[PDB]
Amino acid sequence: TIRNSEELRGKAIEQLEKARARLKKVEMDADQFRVNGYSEIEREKMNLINSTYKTLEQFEN
Amino acid sequence: KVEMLYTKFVSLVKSDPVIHTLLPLSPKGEICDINGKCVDAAEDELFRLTTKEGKLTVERDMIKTETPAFSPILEFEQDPAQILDALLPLYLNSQILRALQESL
Amino acid sequence: MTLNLCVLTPNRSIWNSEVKEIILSTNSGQIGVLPNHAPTATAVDIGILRIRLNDQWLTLALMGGFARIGNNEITILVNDAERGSDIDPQEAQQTLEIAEANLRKAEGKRQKIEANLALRRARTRVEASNT
Amino acid sequence: VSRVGSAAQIKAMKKVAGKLKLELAQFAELEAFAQFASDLDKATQNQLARGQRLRELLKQPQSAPLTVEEQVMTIYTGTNGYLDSLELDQVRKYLVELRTYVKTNKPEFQEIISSTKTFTEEAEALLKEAIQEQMERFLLQ
Amino acid sequence: CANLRELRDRIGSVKNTQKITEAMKLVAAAKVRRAQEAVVNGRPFSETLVEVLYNMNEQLQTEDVDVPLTKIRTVKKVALMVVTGDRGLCGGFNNMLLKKAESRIAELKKLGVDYT
Amino acid sequence: LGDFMDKRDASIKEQLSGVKDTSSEVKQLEEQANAVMRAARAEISAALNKMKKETQ
Amino acid sequence: PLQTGLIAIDAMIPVGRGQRELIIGDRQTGKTAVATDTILNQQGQNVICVYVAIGQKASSVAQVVTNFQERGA
Numbered sequence: 208t209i210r211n212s213e214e215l216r217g218k219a220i221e222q223l224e225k226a227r228a229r230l231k232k233v234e235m236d237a238d239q240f241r242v243n244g245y246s247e248i249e250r251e252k253m254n255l256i257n258s259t260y261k262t263l264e265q266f267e268n
Numbered sequence: 269k270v271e272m273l274y275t276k277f278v279s280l281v282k283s284d285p286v287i288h289t290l291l292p293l294s295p296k297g298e299i300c301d302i303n304g305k306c307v308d309a310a311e312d313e314l315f316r317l318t319t320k321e322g323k324l325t326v327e328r329d330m331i332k333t334e335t336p337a338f339s340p341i342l343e344f345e346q347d348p349a350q351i352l353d354a355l356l357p358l359y360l361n362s363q364i365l366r367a368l369q370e371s372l
Numbered sequence: 373m374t375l376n377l378c379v380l381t382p383n384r385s386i387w388n389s390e391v392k393e394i395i396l397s398t399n400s401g402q403i404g405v406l407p408n409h410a411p412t413a414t415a416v417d418i419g420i421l422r423i424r425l426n427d428q429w430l431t432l433a434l435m436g437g438f439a440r441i442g443n444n445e446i447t448i449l450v451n452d453a454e455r456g457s458d459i460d461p462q463e464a465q466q467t468l469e470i471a472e473a474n475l476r477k478a479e480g481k482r483q484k485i486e487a488n489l490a491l492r493r494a495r496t497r498v499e500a501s502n503t
Numbered sequence: 504v505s506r507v508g509s510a511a512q513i514k515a516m517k518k519v520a521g522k523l524k525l526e527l528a529q530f531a532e533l534e535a536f537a538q539f540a541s542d543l544d545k546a547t548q549n550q551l552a553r554g555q556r557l558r559e560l561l562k563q564p565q566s567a568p569l570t571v572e573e574q575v576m577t578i579y580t581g582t583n584g585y586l587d588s589l590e591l592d593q594v595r596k597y598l599v600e601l602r603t604y605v606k607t608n609k610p611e612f613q614e615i616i617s618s619t620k621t622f623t624e625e626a627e628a629l630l631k632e633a634i635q636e637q638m639e640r641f642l643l644q
Numbered sequence: 645c646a647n648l649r650e651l652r653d654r655i656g657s658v659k660n661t662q663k664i665t666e667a668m669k670l671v672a673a674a675k676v677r678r679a680q681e682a683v684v685n686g687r688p689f690s691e692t693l694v695e696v697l698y699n700m701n702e703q704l705q706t707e708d709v710d711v712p713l714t715k716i717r718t719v720k721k722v723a724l725m726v727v728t729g730d731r732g733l734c735g736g737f738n739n740m741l742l743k744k745a746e747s748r749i750a751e752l753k754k755l756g757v758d759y760t
Numbered sequence: 761l762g763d764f765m766d767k768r769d770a771s772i773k774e775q776l777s778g779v780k781d782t783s784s785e786v787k788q789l790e791e792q793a794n795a796v797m798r799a800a801r802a803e804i805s806a807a808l809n810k811m812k813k814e815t816q
Numbered sequence: 817p818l819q820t821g822l823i824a825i826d827a828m829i830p831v832g833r834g835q836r837e838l839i840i841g842d843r844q845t846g847k848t849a850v851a852t853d854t855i856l857n858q859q860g861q862n863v864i865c866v867y868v869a870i871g872q873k874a875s876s877v878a879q880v881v882t883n884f885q886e887r888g889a
């Protein structure tokens with residue numbers, strides 16, 4: 208009782224709540240994963256328009 | 269008189285399907301045939317696939333398992349009858365699985 | 373502290389290891405066996421082979437067989453054995469209920485032995501939830 | 504066949520195309536066993552499965568140009584087993600996403616392969632770590 | 645060219661057939677070897693079993709009032725059974741086995757056994 | 761003494777209840793674990809696909 | 817070597833600068849497609865990829881020239 212009631216309770220709570228904290232950390236890195244593609248794929252519109260603007264400039268020539 | 273038709277594995281070219289009696293079991297253990305090549309038990313056939321000069325072929329092994337007749341004392345926890353009634357279904361199952369394995 | 377244990381079966385050799393105790397269940401007795409035992413020859417049938425290795429009391433349920441269980445070199449010629457935790461709990465309980473479904477069928481004296489063996493399959497299966 | 508052989512390719516290709524050619528030879532020989540491989544031994548099974556993935560590695564879209572660096576890592580991924588866990592279908596998607604991720608987030612591989620033109624150990628380790636991280640994010644799907 | 649092209653088709657199909665039946669030959673050889681290995685696995689058990697059965701019949705001199713599996717006292721209703729293989733083209737297997745089956749069931753209906 | 765003994769037994773039960781709360785919340789959070797990245801990333805990705813279609 | 821952009825014809829069987837490999841095959845299989853893949857990959861490099869079309873219809877050559885234009889090669 209004396210050994211196991213602490214040897215399986217407290218560390219389990221610690222890993223359990225640190226698992227929620229690590230979930231919050233990797234969720235924050237997922238909030239960064241928003242930026243990881245979002246600021247560029249908001250531009251990808253003007254990217255696929257302006258890259259072909261040069262071929263349209265060859266069309267103007 | 270539950271006899272079975274399992275196709276024993278004599279040769280690679282053609283293996284003739286033999287007919288053996290199964291369930292009466294001949295309580296000395298000897299599983300016997302259709303009366304004319306009937307087999308004594310513990311004289312077992314174990315087929316082995318080795319290549320001849322060059323080809324694939326099967327060669328039998330008629331290995332005879334030596335039997336230490338009895339343990340020095342050989343106590344029974346059961347009666348002499350119950351032990352056989354619980355043992356011969358086991359040998360029946362073993363022979364059925366062998367007649368599936370060699371047939372396959 | 374143990375014996376040479378060889379639980380065999382038709383197409384396999386289930387569990388060849390060394391264990392402190394052997395509590396195989398025959399019809400007339402659940403004979404506990406442990407080192408240096410005198411040579412007995414049990415007709416072990418349906419029931420659990422509860423063994424107590426010093427790590428834990430891992431149980432295996434065997435459908436039937438025989439055991440020339442002698443001086444630390446035993447050969448339990450088991451018909452059908454499922455070792456340790458290879459059996460699964462909820463499927464075992466549903467299998468017990470299906471064994472009840474096979475228990476109430478029919479036919480005089482011909483099929484009642486299969487009914488018995490289905491009941492005893494369920495007795496083999498109760499080991500799973502107890503494991 | 505090509506009469507030139509490995510006298511044309513770069514050192515990275517001279518390394519990895521050897522294993523690719525050998526594995527495609529073995530897979531093409533074992534191609535009849537594919538539909539009949541029923542629990543055959545692990546060597547045949549894994550080699551044939553990697554060949555079944557290798558042909559999917561080979562098939563590439565219309566008008567898609569794969570420059571030397573990207574196809575190098577693609578052949579390596581296909582031949583050394585770092586796509587064996589995925590099924591047959593997902594090899595294509597996983598490899599396109601891996602090529603994107605690598606060519607956009609490990610520009611040192613570009614420096615090595617385009618510059619030193621050999622598959623040296625630093626490039627091998629960089630590619631290994633990149634493929635591993637991409638397999639983790641592809642398990643995360 | 646509808647003359648040479650048909651023969652090219654037959655050449656390709658016969659070559660692919662040769663490849664496929666060679667694969668089936670090697671697969672069947674591996675299957676025979678793994679069944680032989682299963683028999684070799686099962687042989688220790690059967691060895692100790694045909695030793696233990698001799699042991700039991702050596703203790704008791706077939707003195708027994710038991711064993712329903714040795715009710716040998718008539719030939720009333722034989723139950724012949726056939727173990728057959730489940731594959732296609734099966735060599736010349738199925739015809740041989742069920743031919744022996746038909747011969748023996750005819751010879752059993754000679755005796756009036758109602759063979760199941 | 762009956763109170764003290766059932767206090768022992770209920771203390772065993774309470775550490776078991778703490779381990780059970782742990783085992784349940786582990787399942788809940790580990791379900792959340794990949795699901796949060798899936799939600800955010802796939803919500804960006806499919807919306808990107810549709811916005812990219814209408815802008816093509 | 818001369819990268820075509822294809823793993824098949826760049827790993828199994830190379831094409832080096834100077835070696836005159838041959839794209840044979842059944843009609844409608846991708847010969848013009850593998851040739852187009854080679855000329856389209858050959859952008860980062862410096863090669864002057866002269867593509868001569870003999871007896872192809874005018875409209876297919878229009879499709880190929882506008883494909884080259886769309887890809888910038």
Ligand SMILES: Nc1ncnc2c1ncn2[C@@H]1O[C@H](COP(=O)(O)OP(=O)(O)OP(=O)(O)O)[C@@H](O)[C@H]1O
Nearest residue numbers: 563564565566842843844845846847848849850872
């Ligand atoms: N990687 C690919 N993905 C999808 N389609 C492809 C691919 N490669 C080739 N194709 C198909 O190949 C066709 C064009 O091939 P190609 O023009 O070489 O055929 P062809 O008739 O032999 O040419 P030609 O008319 O010059 O003889 C297209 O219809 C295209 O669909």
